[PDB]
Amino acid sequence: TPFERVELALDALREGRGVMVLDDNEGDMIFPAETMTVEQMALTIRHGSGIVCLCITEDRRKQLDLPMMVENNTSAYGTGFTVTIEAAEGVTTGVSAADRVTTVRAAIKDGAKPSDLNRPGHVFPLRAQAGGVLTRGGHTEATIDLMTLAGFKPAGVLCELTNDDGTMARAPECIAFAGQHNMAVVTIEDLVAYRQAH
Amino acid sequence: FGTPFERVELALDALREGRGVMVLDNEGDMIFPAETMTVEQMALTIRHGSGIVCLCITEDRRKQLDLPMMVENNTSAYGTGFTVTIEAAEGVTTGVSAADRVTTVRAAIKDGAKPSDLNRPGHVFPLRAQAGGVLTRGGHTEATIDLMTLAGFKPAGVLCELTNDDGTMARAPECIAFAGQHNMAVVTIEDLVAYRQAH
């Protein structure tokens, strides 16, 4: 059931596993920002678009002082990238799985201040829409709600799953793949239903 | 091994034959003529790259498209110089597929491209090359630009860092092994700097 699938995912997150979030033809591996490992970051760079985003809230955004990249968002989904980031220390080129994580941990770390970060960089922040999947049915909000439900900071890492031939992964592939990495599979509809109820 | 000048010219050939170049200075960047790059190639660079696939351009292509610099005060360790990211305003879907990235790229360079040809933000990341090239700034950005203009191309080229699968950045021997396995010409920014100084 929707509710079963949602709660089963919330578990996965707490056990520090990944979730494969789907909707409508693209699946996003996502992780708690707080728990994610280099090995996991490597995995997402290895099979992701390599465009690895850090979903955050408008308040974490204000806290770090990250302006929205564009004043007038014209992308097909109003995707909502802010200004990109690099950990102001602990990193080198900022591209290694090791470095991306480090950048990420600097962003979430309790009481992170803007000087903790360098702009631009190789981690790409996504501001979640206030209201979550009920305001906006996107992987961005989906990622945020799962984290806050799981009881985490409202910050989580995400990435599209890519076939090696370069095509975006379809559900059966996202599913095959989630299965092969102890990742809980869920859908934004499931999450919307779950939330509507509660 | 040969010479700086030999290596440089040998690369300029690779580019015209529509092959790739492995540019080193440590971190190696696969790069391609923006104009000639194929989805298969884009796939290859997403499959072994950081996945962060950039489109090096000139300040004039930047003005033409009306892309502001992402940050007003660049504080990155290398002043890397990203502008506002992009998506092809048509022909694409989610903009992430190798197919889609290319399409975004072709829209950007296409003769007489106007800003309305593009959507911001998106999944291709423009890099504005510093006026003066590798002689002003010794970066993969300018290295990419000079090679394209030397090869006789538009001053626009696609680039990406080579990543080991374990998630570590590729070192030279790897970049070399790899370039070798894809008919890619290997060159270094020093070689290019030397080449330019002469001419």
Q: Which domains does chain B have, with CATH numbers?
A: 1-199 (3.90.870.10)
CB atoms within 10 A of CB A175: 16
Upper half-sphere CA count for residue B9 (Cβ side, 13 Å): 6
Cα(B4)–Cα(A49) distance, integer angstroms: 35
Task: Tell me the chain A residues in contact with residue B49 when contact means C-beta distances shorter than 8 Å.
Answer: 50
Dihedral angle over CA of A116, A121, A122, A124, nearest 10: 80
Buried b (16+ CB within 10 A) or exposed e, B100-123: bbbbbbebbbeeeeeeebbbbbbb
Is there a contact between B99 and A75 if contact means CB atoms under 8 Å apart? Answer: no
Distance from CA of B106 to the nearest CA of A (A): 17
Cα(B21)–Cα(B184) distance, integer angstroms: 5
Pairing of strands A117-127, A85-87: antiparallel
Residue with token string 């760079």: A45
* Backbone φ and ψ of A6, nearest 5°: -60, -50
Inter-CA distances, B134 with A39, B5, B184, B190, Å? 35, 15, 21, 9
Candidates A38, A43, A166; nearest CB to B97: A166
**Annotated binding residue A140:** yes
**Annotated binding residue A138:** yes
Alpha helices in A48-167 (DSSP H): 58-64, 97-108, 139-150
Residue with token string 């700086």: B4
Cis check for the bond before A120: say yes or no (omega within 30 of 0): yes
Q: Is B138 helix (H, G, I), strand (E, B) or coil?
A: coil
Cβ(A16)–Cβ(A197) under 8 Å?
Answer: no
For residue A106, the one-letter residue type is: A
Q: Is B170 helix (H, G, I), strand (E, B) or coil?
A: coil
Is there a contact between A162 and B97 if contact means CB atoms under 8 Å apart? Answer: yes
Strand order in the sheet with A28-32: A85-87, A117-127, A53-56, A156-160, A28-32, A19-22, A184-187
Q: Is B116 helix (H, G, I), strand (E, B) or coil?
A: helix
Cβ(A140)–Cβ(A55) under 8 Å?
Answer: yes
For residue B195, the one-letter residue type is: Y
Taking only residues 16 to 45 of chain B, the set having a beta carbon closer than 8 angstroms to any beta carbon of chain A reads 27, 39-40, 42-44
A118 close contact with B: CB closer than 8 A: yes
Distance from CA of A33 to the nearest CA of B (A): 18
Is there a contact between B47 and A166 if contact means CB atoms under 8 Å apart? Answer: yes
Residue with token string 């990203």: B82
Cα(B83)–Cα(A178) distance, integer angstroms: 35
Candidates A52, A81, A162; nearest CB to B46: A162
Give the resolution to one decimal, in Å.
2.8
B172 close contact with A: CB closer than 8 A: no
Interface test mutation site (partner B, options A38, A43, A69, A161, max chain B beta carbons within 10 A): A69
* Burial of residue A30, with CB atoms counted within 10 A of its CB: 0-12 exposed, 13-18 middle, 19 or more buried: buried
